[PDB]
């Protein structure tokens, strides 16, 4: 019967709720007292990357912490040098509705997908000079929300038809397919060892997946609305979120429940992308009221504000060495906040 | 300028990339980006056949004006999470089939098909993004609308109608049930047109109504309005 299975599933929901309550002996906010607070961190705009002409919807730092791809809502995908703010490439995309962007961690490839449901993969370091499309990864139904390279041949593209996927670039077919979400998937983040990834969604639930196994390890819940930001802790054992009830939550993969919450009562707006710092002490979350504000990650004190943008900060990225923070907004500028 | 011979020639690449974005940000500013919304079973395919995956950009020129229409009906995803991509369109072309006033949708409980295209109309007028973007509204299939209003009245879809089973007494009733769904009578205009087989004068309506939007958007950009 369909009725007795819903009679059973809530008991398993009542068993996971009891098991997480058997482990919540001490809150993180009371363990993370009796330590030094981080104090106010002020970060000034060091660069402004100007050349876009529409809403920057995504960016991704290249793994050398100097290059920077940035997909915006014209047909362009500009690869910025950051240290002397030149444009290394400008890649005219085939559909100008791109909701995501990814720099491959070898430097060679760059992917961007969007409302065309297709994850085009570009080959920068080539022989004939110009940046060339190597693949167009079809096969999703809804819009693409986030693309992430594991290496130069696997890419994890979470789309909006309630499904993530794992691709093989050299062939062009989905190897696995991570389903189990209700409602859209809005952002993913690979673990720093690239074995697991989480995937925030529009049913207020992140979900820890395994790229080798093929289905969900554990499903986190606790938000009130659409989760549209995910960042792993740099340890790779916890992860933040960000949602449209204007609150972050630091979850944990080993305790299977959220550890703290990041809400100020003077913000009501919603979150577009979060990102930890190096060492996992800051939780720089990008909000709809045009400002990032650096939460301390252990105590919920809002330890600064990166207001320099004239519209919604819709993409946020900390370098792989932690030397700078690049945010990009719905006005076409992309300020780098060292 | 303490730049090397290659650091100088890298900036010359950045300046000749900038000169190709600004030269392609003027081929993109000359074009008019519409947005063909509408519910299912309306006749959006009647209109993109009258002119010329997920999104499908349709290009067509009229009187040296290059248009672009984005039919997002093939998305089948949540409309909330990508409708801010079209925040700066010129004019939301809407489509309402007049002929679905007596048809129903089998999925939801009551689900008059006209009652949901009215509810999508209220959901895109009153978006926080579509404050300025003036809706062009195409009431499709008025020729099929006469050949079933002489049989069946509009009192099915709307109890609050007091009139006879005639076209003009009721086709203008639907327009005044649509033009008042916006809570912004001051910020945007709703242009309405009754397309059946009017295939010459539908792009002419869009060229006139976009030129009305282009003029009023200029006169606020100058401050004069």
């Amino acid at each position, epitope marked *: 019967e369909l009725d007795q299975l819903r009679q059973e599933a809530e008991q398993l929901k009542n068993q996971i709720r009891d098991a997480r309550k058997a482990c919540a002996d001490a809150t993180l906010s009371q363990i993370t007292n009796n330590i030094d607070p981080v104090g106010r961190i002020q970060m000034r705009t060091r660069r402004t990357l100007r050349g876009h002409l529409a809403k920057i919807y995504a960016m991704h730092w290249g793994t050398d912490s*100097r*290059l920077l791809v940035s997909a915006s809502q014209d047909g362009k995908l500009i690869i910025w*040098d950051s*240290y*002397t703010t*030149n444009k*290394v*490439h400008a890649i005219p995309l085939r559909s100008s509705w791109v909701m995501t962007c990814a720099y491959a961690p070898s*430097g060679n490839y760059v992917a961007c997908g969007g409302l065309d449901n297709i994850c085009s993969i570009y080959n920068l*370091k080539t*022989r*004939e*000079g*110009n940046v060339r499309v190597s693949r167009e990864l079809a096969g999703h139904t809804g819009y693409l929300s986030c693309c992430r390279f594991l290496d130069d041949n696997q890419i994890v593209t979470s789309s909006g038809d309630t499904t993530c996927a794992l691709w093989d670039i050299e062939t062009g077919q989905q190897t696995t397919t991570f389903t189990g979400h209700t409602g859209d998937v809005m952002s993913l983040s690979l673990a720093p060892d690239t074995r697991l990834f989480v995937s925030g969604a529009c049913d207020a639930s992140a979900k820890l997946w395994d790229v080798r196994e093929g289905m969900c390890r554990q499903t986190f819940t606790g938000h009130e609305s659409d989760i549209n930001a995910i960042c792993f802790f740099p340890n790779g054992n916890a992860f933040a979120t960000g949602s449209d009830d204007a609150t972050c939550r630091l979850f944990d993969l080993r305790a299977d429940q959220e550890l703290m919450t990041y809400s100020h009562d003077n913000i009501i707006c919603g979150i577009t992308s979060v990102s930890f710092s190096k060492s996992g002490r800051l939780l720089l979350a990008g909000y709809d009221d045009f400002n990032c504000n650096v939460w301390d990650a252990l105590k919920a004190d809002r330890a600064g504000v990166l207001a320099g943008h004239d519209n919604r900060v819709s993409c946020l990225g900390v370098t792989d060495d932690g030397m700078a923070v690049a945010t990009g907004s719905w006005d076409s500028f992309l300020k780098i906040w060292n | 300028c*303490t730049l*090397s*011979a*290659e*650091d100088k*020639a*890298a900036v*010359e*690449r950045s300046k*000749m990339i900038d000169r190709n974005l600004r030269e392609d940000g003027e081929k993109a500013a000359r074009e008019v980006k519409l947005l063909l919304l509408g519910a299912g079973e309306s006749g959006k395919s009647t209109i993109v056949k009258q002119m010329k995956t997920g999104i499908v950009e349709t290009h067509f020129t009229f009187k040296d004006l290059h248009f672009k229409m984005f039919d997002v009906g093939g998305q089948r995803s949540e409309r909330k999470k990508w409708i801010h991509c079209f925040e700066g369109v010129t004019a939301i072309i809407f489509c309402v089939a007049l002929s679905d006033y007596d048809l129903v949708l089998a999925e939801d409980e009551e689900m008059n098909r006209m009652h949901e295209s009215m509810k999508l109309f209220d959901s895109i007028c009153n978006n926080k993004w579509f404050t300025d973007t003036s809706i062009i509204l195409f009431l499709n299939k008025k020729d099929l609308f006469e050949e079933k209003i002489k049989k069946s009245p509009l009192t099915i879809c709307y109890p609050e109608y007091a009139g006879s089973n005639t076209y003009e007494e009721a086709a203008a009733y639907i327009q005044c049930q649509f033009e008042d769904l916006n809570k912004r009578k001051d910020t945007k205009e709703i242009y309405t047109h009754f397309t059946c087989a009017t295939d010459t004068k539908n792009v002419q309506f869009v060229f006139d109504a976009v030129t009305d939007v282009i003029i009023k958007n200029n006169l606020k950009d100058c401050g004069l309005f």
Partner: single-chain antibody
Amino acid sequence: VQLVESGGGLVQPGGSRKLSCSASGFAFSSFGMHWVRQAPEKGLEWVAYISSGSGTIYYADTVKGRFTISRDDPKNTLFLQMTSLRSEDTAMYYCVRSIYYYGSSPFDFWGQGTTLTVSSDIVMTQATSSVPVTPGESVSISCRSSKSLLHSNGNTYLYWFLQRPGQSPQLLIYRMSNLASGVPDRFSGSGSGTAFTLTISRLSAEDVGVYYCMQHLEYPLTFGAGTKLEL
């Protein structure tokens, strides 16, 4: 990807000739192109330069004012009109391509090179003779500038070229330590400042040829006289 060259012949001194190279196989309009000549018993020597979009043209001081480098980017050809040529302008005139962005490899492709016979500044000091060597041997080929090549941005602009004889030189080490695409990994460059070494750890007989170093800090743009290798 090739860069074939036209022109060539035997003009009288005071005469003129127009070299042209037809570049095909790459997006030519975004490549800074060069002209590099090689006197027939001697090493390489730099002649002219045109940038992407022809927006910046340099010349060497020996051929400044007489030579005019130009190109037609829709035609995918690069010219060099030489006027009032001397008897020291007899050389094989290679064409080079070089794209400059962050992390690019300039001078990566060299043309065939047409001989143009005529009828009769950083200095790079290699100074090493035709070294006889057995394969499998670690060879250190050392160049030495007259300036600290390490720029303020941390890049050391030294390039290492292998001209196998009968061919055009090809890039090996496209900055201080880097390696061109296609060079086997046994080649390695080392050093900083003024003293640089190209160390081929494993050897063969296929990488025999003469080895030029080149600086790239500023557009004098001189080559070293090549350390010849032989078996």
